[PDB]
Amino acid sequence: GTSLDLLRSLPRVSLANLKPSPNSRKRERRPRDRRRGRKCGRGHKGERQRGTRPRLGFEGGQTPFYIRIPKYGFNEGHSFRHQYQPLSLRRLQYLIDLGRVDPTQPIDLTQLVNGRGVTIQPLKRDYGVQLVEEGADTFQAKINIEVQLASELAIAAIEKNGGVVTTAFYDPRSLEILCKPIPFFLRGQPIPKRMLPPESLVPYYTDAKNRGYLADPAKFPEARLELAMKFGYVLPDITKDELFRMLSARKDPRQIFFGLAPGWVVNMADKKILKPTDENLLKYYSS
Amino acid sequence: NPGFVESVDEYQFVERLLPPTKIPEPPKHKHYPTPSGWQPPRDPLPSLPYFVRRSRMHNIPVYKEITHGNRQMTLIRKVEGDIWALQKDVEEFLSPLLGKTPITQVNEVTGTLRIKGYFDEQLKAWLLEKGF
Amino acid sequence: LTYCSTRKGKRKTVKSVVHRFLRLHSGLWLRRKAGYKKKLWKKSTARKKRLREFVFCSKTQSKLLDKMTTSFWKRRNWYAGDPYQMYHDRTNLRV
Amino acid sequence: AFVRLTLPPPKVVDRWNEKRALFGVYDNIGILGNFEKHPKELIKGPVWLRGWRGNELQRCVRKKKFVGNRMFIEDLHNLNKRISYLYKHFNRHGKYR
Amino acid sequence: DPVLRKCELRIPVHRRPVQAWVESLRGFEQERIGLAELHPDVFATAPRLDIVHQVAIWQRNFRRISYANTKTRAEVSGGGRKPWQQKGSGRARHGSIRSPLWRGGGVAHGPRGPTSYYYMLPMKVRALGLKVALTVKLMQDDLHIVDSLELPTADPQYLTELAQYRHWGSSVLLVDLTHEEMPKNVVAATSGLNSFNLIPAVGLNVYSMLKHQTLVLTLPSVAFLEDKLLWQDSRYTPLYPFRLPYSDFP
Ligand SMILES: [Mg+2]
Ligand SMILES: [Mg+2]
Ligand SMILES: [Mg+2]
Ligand SMILES: [Mg+2]
Ligand SMILES: [Mg+2]
Ligand SMILES: [Mg+2]
């Protein structure tokens, strides 16, 4: 624009002409002068001028406020409670529209992470993502998605458009590998197995109404229909759909990645995969 | 005999896992506005003196901000050309709603415009009409 | 408190605060009432009801409690089934 | 006060010697080099403060961790005494609580 | 045969490109041999001198380590005993001959040990500074795009006279694509010159551009610089260090 024309007229830019942005630096004040010297802002002789006032929270000898209030367990066990990041249907629809997630293929945590759709902190006790009903009315996509937790209304929205949603469990060690797979391959170790849910979480993941990954497949057809009746839509049949194979794809309950089995080694340097030939090893991984 | 057998066929799944470094360009849609609400810049470009560019995420750069805990403002950021012309248009567009001329700041060095009060939704719709 | 620790050079949390108060992400703090388990036989029915409640803290108490805890206790927590999910935010507040 | 009675000998500075001419080269090694090296790895100095900064108490404790076991007896005695003095100043004294 | 170059990357529709004369060094009069186009987003950014100030100061300060030191009253030799008793003497009260008040005593507030000044500016900010510096040289007519650095003779005098002939500055910075393949003739001529400096493309920095009056870029380096800087725009944040494998990044 016109600004660059000004440069042509003005003298050369050099190390003798530099200037900071105005107001970017304040002035630091030393106690030399009369305004800021003498008593130097500390007051008259006492404990505070000399520099030895009591600590924060001390009230002069009466029992302090933060210790006269009774103890109660608001934060008991906080470091052991499980955490799930929320993913709303507004956010999911937004991501598909801009092309940062590919709806043709199945969607799992790895694909969500790779598109910056979600940020996962395993060291802060994140165990995965839960689908949230907000934005359900305007969801107009057909997809295959796997999440750790789901809500009643969120499941309805996905399926009404002819899609599949399922709930799956990952352990702390597996979750770290899932989010950042490439650094694991650089280590040179075999892929580990996936542990089953703790005892308390077994009822949730073996229940059809939750779309669990360990529930009886025979009972799914009944559950899907009842949602259609309750929320007033017609249950579509996906077997007719051309993409039935994609929508039906599901991984083994002891598998982390779709096309890879426990016990394999990924040699990324020369694009090869190594498999063990020992019966004891094969039996261990397959169990 | 070695204990490992090497196969090259299954590496395709590993290739899927690789993450990208560049933001993908949005995909073409038959019907706009897109179900979320996103709408791409219109073609041909507007002929106004000032041009407003989009962010790396392909959104209109209008932001709500606060300071001191009680001062509410809205910001239009990536302006090229004559920033002063844009100020005149914003004052005319917003003046009837307020009942007074809005208070504004123009930053020529950073090419941004700052307005007192929250007017992000109206400005976003207003800019789309002009087709930036 | 410890402003600069020997081993890491960081501030330290006062753990007697963590055992007595709850912090909502907006900046509020919750507590109980002193004496809510003591000599209930000599307290009226209205007096006992007031004791059972959860109560908020003043501005000066909130300021002091913030200095005595580190940032880790001030983050966003996403607990499934949280019974305080609706109290972490403010609505219709002009201030 | 007393002042010089003669002018000091002149100082002549060569502004195009090798050190001055090539100052700054390779400060963009990462962005222009595909990020194989971080610019901090270009720094020369004490082992315990390469690519790191801290206050005096932090510097003293960091020095002990890196080379504390390879130090002379008397130097180590003084370092330990400095740490305890700085600990009591930064945790018990000052205007602001 | 004009040498015409086009930007490989996509120029924004609303921005017209900018151009400069291609030149050669084989002769004293081969000033113009071609015409070239330069991406507007690199060579036509806004003229921000505050950012140039920041990057220049970062370069100078992030390396600094000061070795100034002083002894406290604890580390000076001697000083253990109380000199005389509190009362009777009629002198001022004193407890050690090595306090700051005494001649030969310790220093109360002096420099302490080796100290570092390290800090890092955000990567996008440092990349932006390079674009602004390149823009400034072009708009002020201090940039000269060249096809190659080949020279007829290795005599240092020839290069100096050429700079006088074409109205160059007293100090010239010359950039070539890579260190290993730099032409033999150029290396011999520059090595004996204080003010004419030869560096590879990866060594370009804001500080050297300010120090040297005129910049000389070969065409292959222009494509090199354009690629790296424009990548910083339209990228994600890093999931992990960029040196690790990525789908589409070297
Ligand atoms: Mg000071
Ligand atoms: Mg988080
Ligand atoms: Mg002593
Ligand atoms: Mg003694
Ligand atoms: Mg004494
Ligand atoms: Mg001395």
Side-chain angles (χ1 to χ4, degrees), chain A residues 28-31:
Chain A
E28 65 181 1
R29 303 280 187 168
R30 278 157 47 94

Side-chain angles (χ1 to χ4, degrees), chain E residues 3-183:
Chain E
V3 184
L4 316 179
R5 176 212 171 260
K6 314 288 162 297
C7 304
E8 296 79 357
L9 278 297
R10 166 195 51 68
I11 297 185
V13 173
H14 79 274
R15 294 212 72 193
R16 168 180 291 273
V18 69
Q19 297 182 354
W21 287 111
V22 168
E23 327 184 6
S24 184
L25 303 162
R26 289 163 182 288
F28 285 130
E29 298 185 5
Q30 313 185 29
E31 292 185 350
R32 37 191 82 87
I33 292 186
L35 209 71
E37 274 184 350
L38 314 165
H39 204 289
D41 284 354
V42 177
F43 294 82
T45 81
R48 297 184 62 90
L49 295 181
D50 47 337
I51 293 179
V52 160
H53 181 75
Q54 289 180 77
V55 177
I57 282 170
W58 167 80
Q59 271 179 111
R60 201 187 164 194
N61 284 8
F62 87 103
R63 292 181 168 286
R64 185 192 178 188
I65 300 169
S66 69
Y67 298 95
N69 193 68
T70 57
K71 288 173 162 68
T72 61
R73 55 182 301 172
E75 302 164 338
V76 174
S77 168
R81 69 215 277 158
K82 183 175 185 54
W84 51 86
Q85 62 194 6
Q86 288 285 106
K87 291 181 179 183
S89 296
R91 297 209 60 161
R93 305 178 298 188
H94 290 283
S96 164
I97 58 146
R98 304 293 191 213
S99 86
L101 304 202
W102 287 60
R103 171 191 179 270
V107 191
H109 299 296
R112 288 299 287 161
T115 78
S116 65
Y117 294 72
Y118 174 77
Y119 72 101
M120 287 296 299
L121 284 172
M123 183 161 69
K124 283 170 184 167
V125 177
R126 287 181 270 127
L128 181 50
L130 262 181
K131 296 199 283 269
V132 180
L134 282 170
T135 302
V136 164
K137 302 302 253 195
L138 177 66
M139 290 294 109
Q140 289 191 331
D141 294 303
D142 276 310
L143 174 65
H144 300 307
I145 305 293
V146 166
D147 52 359
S148 57
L149 278 164
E150 198 62 65
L151 278 168
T153 187
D155 170 17
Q157 180 63 10
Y158 165 87
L159 186 52
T160 73
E161 288 158 325
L162 194 159
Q164 308 167 36
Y165 188 71
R166 299 204 199 169
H167 295 264
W168 289 354
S170 50
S171 46
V172 184
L173 173 62
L174 297 79
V175 178
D176 184 19
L177 183 59
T178 49
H179 180 88
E180 63 87 15
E181 62 86 18
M182 302 212 266

Side-chain angles (χ1 to χ4, degrees), chain B residues 78-96:
Chain B
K78 328 184 72 178
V79 185
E80 297 189 10
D82 177 14
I83 192 66
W84 293 111
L86 176 62
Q87 185 200 26
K88 193 169 177 174
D89 298 7
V90 167
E91 275 172 341
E92 296 162 357
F93 166 75
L94 293 171
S95 45

Side-chain angles (χ1 to χ4, degrees), chain A residues 234-254:
Chain A
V234 173
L235 192 146
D237 183 357
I238 59 167
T239 66
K240 302 295 184 180
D241 193 312
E242 181 175 1
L243 303 162
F244 181 61
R245 300 195 186 189
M246 186 268 301
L247 297 179
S248 61
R250 280 174 55 169
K251 57 177 51 157
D252 181 299
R254 305 296 296 270

Side-chain angles (χ1 to χ4, degrees), chain A residues 58-75:
Chain A
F58 187 78
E59 288 188 354
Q62 72 174 13
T63 314
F65 162 75
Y66 77 101
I67 287 168
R68 67 188 308 114
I69 297 309
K71 271 171 158 185
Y72 183 85
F74 290 108
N75 291 296

Side-chain angles (χ1 to χ4, degrees), chain D residues 5 7-8 11 15-18 23 25 30 32 35 37-38 43 51-52 68 85-86 92 96-97:
Chain D
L5 293 178
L7 271 166
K11 177 175 64 62
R15 297 270 173 206
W16 286 98
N17 63 27
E18 196 152 6
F23 184 87
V25 175
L32 302 184
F35 305 109
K37 301 191 63 54
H38 196 300
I43 295 163
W52 176 93
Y85 170 85
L86 289 171
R92 300 178 190 169
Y96 309 126
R97 286 305 179 261

Side-chain angles (χ1 to χ4, degrees), chain D:
Chain D
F2 303 111
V3 192
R4 290 182 65 103
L5 293 178
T6 60
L7 271 166
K11 177 175 64 62
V12 63
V13 173
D14 184 353
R15 297 270 173 206
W16 286 98
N17 63 27
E18 196 152 6
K19 203 199 194 80
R20 288 201 176 89
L22 303 177
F23 184 87
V25 175
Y26 302 128
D27 279 343
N28 288 303
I29 191 68
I31 65 177
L32 302 184
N34 284 294
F35 305 109
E36 279 151 22
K37 301 191 63 54
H38 196 300
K40 75 184 174 177
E41 307 171 29
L42 279 289
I43 295 163
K44 282 187 200 162
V47 175
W48 59 91
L49 54 80
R50 283 172 193 156
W52 176 93
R53 184 169 73 175
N55 70 34
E56 202 198 334
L57 177 45
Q58 291 160 347
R59 278 189 267 124
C60 277
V61 173
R62 188 158 162 104
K63 173 177 161 64
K64 190 173 156 201
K65 286 170 180 189
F66 273 69
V67 302
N69 52 358
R70 296 196 292 123
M71 278 173 73
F72 295 0
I73 287 169
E74 284 161 10
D75 292 332
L76 188 59
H77 182 62
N78 280 346
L79 184 55
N80 275 316
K81 269 198 303 176
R82 184 59 169 172
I83 281 152
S84 69
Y85 170 85
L86 289 171
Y87 172 92
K88 296 186 290 172
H89 188 69
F90 281 0
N91 287 302
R92 300 178 190 169
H93 296 115
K95 184 174 192 178
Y96 309 126
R97 286 305 179 261

